[model samples]
Target chain A: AELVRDRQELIDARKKELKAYMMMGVTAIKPLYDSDVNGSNKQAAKEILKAMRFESDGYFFAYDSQGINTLHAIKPSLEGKNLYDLKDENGVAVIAGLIDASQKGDGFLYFSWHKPTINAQAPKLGYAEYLQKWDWVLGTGIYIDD
Target chain B: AELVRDRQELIDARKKELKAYMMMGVTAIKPLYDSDVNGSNKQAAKEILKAMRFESDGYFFAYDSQGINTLHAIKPSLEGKNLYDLKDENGVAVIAGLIDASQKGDGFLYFSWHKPTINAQAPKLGYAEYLQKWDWVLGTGIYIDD
Candidate 1:
């Protein structure tokens, strides 16, 4: 019981650390967004993130302030959509909520979302950072499963 | 460092424990249903459950298989309603869901429900039981916010 309670608290703490990781990712890629006036550098940033995909479930992702998916390593179909209205099984607007959380400054969001392995929606907690210069939301997420 | 999976599993396990407790309560009051033929035994059973009232957030409640309110500790006014058409905020018939869960031989149900403290609707999770002989659906629920 104590084991699980501690686990729960750690997961709660994980949110803060996760948010930090997102901030780090945005920092790593900030220059590309800044130099990509004609969009060449932004595309370069996405490729850099792909080649540097953090881990099995950790990687960089991005969306414009308007909710257009700009970088998504896991789902090709999700990349070009204006996903402002997309909702998870629990009705949490995955893109909209994450963008909002990012706009408030780098932070984490807890919500249900799709996992690539099972290929179905599950509880997914993500972290994001907003690039005020480009109005681009940059971030990454870790799938949580036992 | 770790969690997501552990916390979800433990919380799910807690639901089973909660349902088991509700079932245990049903098992304890079942004899009253078996012998009470005239409904006084049913009322007597309610009094027993009311006296113990498990905790501040939960207690036994009941309805007939036909959706007639049999007992509700927190809201006596709910006792006389023909709840067949009643629905949760999402348009789920709370009574219908409760009876279905009961007939499934007992399980958990989640829906939006009134929280007494807030005097408004909030998410609620419930556990249910079915006494076949008594045509009774007995259960208890807890409001959730987070």
Candidate 2:
């Protein structure tokens, strides 16, 4: 009982922390998002997020409404990929879930993915907020087990 | 982003599992509480819970309405302690939080606790439901950091 109680608290605290980071990231990009709605100031916003990193494994991710990767600070190779059907080990449609949550402005969504740090599939918690003007999902997250 | 997504899914899945275990533990004792609401059938319920263990470190916990420990299978010495003021490292009123959540029939709560398995204060997630007939809080949980 003692052990279980403690673990839950830790997990909840992590969730709170992740939410704050997501909010901060959103705040950082909102001005750029508002700077030019009709034109493309997205490059500047991507550059801002590209320089944002936390801890050892934290970084921001961006995807368009069509599940096309716009920016992935950690993995540049994924920047231009159309990942709408990307599935994890559990068969969860990862990008699709993110788009759904982002469209609804949901709090958090979970999915399994390959963790470069551990070199295996690990669980993740992500928060995606809609950039309605740009039709994009501006998101960030934390790895709980890593 | 990939790694964090996976970790969150795992954590959420564990919370779901913990809730199920708590509900099952409650169901197991409800009949006993109903068997003799005015008598001392608590012993039977305690004995029943004593034999209910899951996974590696999972176990049920019991405490009276006043935050007095009634049953602690892993550490019998805690059975008679008044933990009304017991706090975790974060100064979270551990027992008090449990009793409060139990009273309101809440979902789950968290706290830092010494996990004998790891021999450290690990974060825990617990669900404590009020056994109104017996004035007891029947609880069970999982350690997220374990």
Best by TM-score, which number?
2
Off by over 4 Å in 2: A1-146
Query: What local lDDT score does residue B108 receive in model 1, on the 0 to 100 scale?
Result: 75
Model 2 docking tier (incorrect/acceptable/medium/high): incorrect
Worst 10 residues of 2 chain A by lDDT: A20-29
In order, the first chain's TM-score in every candidate is 0.81, 0.87
Best by lDDT: 2
CAPRI grade of model 1? incorrect
Tens digit of per-residue lDDT, candidate 1, span A40-103: 6776556544433334455567788889988786776778789888887778887888888877
| Residue-wise C-alpha lDDT for candidate 1, range B1-146, written one tens digit per residue | 25878767756755754654464355445456556865667665665454334344556678888799877767878886889778887988888898998787445788887776777898878888777766768877766675
Provide the lowest-lDDT 10-residue window in model 1 chain B. Answer: B47-56
Total backbone collisions for each predicted model? 0, 20
**What lDDT is reached at residue B77 by model 2?**
89
lDDT of 1 at A112: 70
